[PDB]
């Protein structure tokens, strides 16, 4: 079905724009390389590693 | 025989102290149907920390 | 070309039509409400000029398309509520009903129902 897939796609492209803006901040030394990035990224990771790959 | 134990496959900013160990043993006559055995440590001599995939 | 893209075959395919429906509903409401000139309650003879065949074919086509991507009874109920609530631009609403009754399959009785209630 389709509604499922689009729901997934939006759930993804939010985390995508989030990580991208985080990369920009890293590029420009915005957040300052400290720690808060590390914990943030390992939370966008933990978010996706729960039901990662339903396989059909 | 030459066996080679690569602790991981990714090269960093800072070169580790051991990208891989390698052992080599003379095979002698072996003969048909026979079998030789060698045991190797892979396991934590520093930090109690092993990153896995290990490739032997 | 604006009504051509508005026709939601290229669009309604990708976008889930929960919020696309709200988009079309607000679009209908914004077509109704905006520019309420000729509010003259004496707007009787202009029904003859707001006749379906005289009303422009692009207005007709857009109404037709809003009927496709939406449902009949929800549209009529929404119209009942809107025309109860707020002021109107009569040319569009009257030609719109003129298109409504013939467009949708046998909804004369359900229009007459809320007409009788009103």
């Amino acid at each position: 079905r389709v509604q499922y897939l689009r729901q997934i796609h939006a759930n993804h492209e939010t985390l995508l724009r989030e990580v991208q803006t985080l990369r920009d901040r890293l590029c420009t030394e915005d957040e300052a390389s400290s720690c808060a990035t590390a914990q943030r990224l390992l939370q966008v990771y933990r978010q996706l590693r729960h039901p990662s790959l339903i396989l059909l | 025989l030459c066996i080679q134990v690569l602790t991981s496959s990714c090269a960093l900013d800072l070169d580790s102290a051991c990208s891989a160990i390698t052992y080599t043993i003379p095979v002698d006559q072996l003969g048909p149907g026979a079998r030789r055995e060698v045991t190797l440590p892979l396991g934590p001599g520093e930090n109690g920390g092993l990153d896995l995939p290990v490739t032997v | 070309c604006w009504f051509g893209v508005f026709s939601g075959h290229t669009l309604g395919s990708v976008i889930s039509t929960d919020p696309l429906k709200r988009f079309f509903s607000h679009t209908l409401t914004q077509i109704l409400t905006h520019s309420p000139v000729l509010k003259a309650s004496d707007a009787v003879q202009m029904q003859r000029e707001w006749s379906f065949a005289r009303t422009h074919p692009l207005l007709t086509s857009l109404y037709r398309r809003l009927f496709v991507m939406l449902s009949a009874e929800e549209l009529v109920g929404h119209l009942q509520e809107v025309l109860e609530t707020q002021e109107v631009h009569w040319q569009r609403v009257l030609s719109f009903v003129s298109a409504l009754v013939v467009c949708f399959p046998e909804a004369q009785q359900l229009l007459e129902d809320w007409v009788a209630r009103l």
Binding site: I8 | - | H9, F67, V68, F104
Partner: protein
């Protein structure tokens, strides 16, 4: 790329008649080619592999 290429595959009296005809056009396409989905989910699995390696390397520190 998964959802985009999927969404491209997902896409692939007179007035009463036009209404049912255009309804029939927008009669929702509920289905998607499974073999494409599988091909993408392998591409994805290989990137997931790279990400999970990088996450161990970093959550250790």
């Amino acid at each position: 790329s998964l959802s985009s290429a999927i969404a491209k595959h997902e896409s692939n009296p007179y007035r009463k008649e036009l209404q049912r005809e255009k309804k029939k056009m927008l009669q929702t396409n509920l289905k998607v080619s499974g073999a494409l989905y599988r091909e993408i989910t392998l591409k994805v699995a290989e990137v997931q592999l790279k990400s999970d390696f990088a996450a161990q390397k970093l959550s250790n520190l």
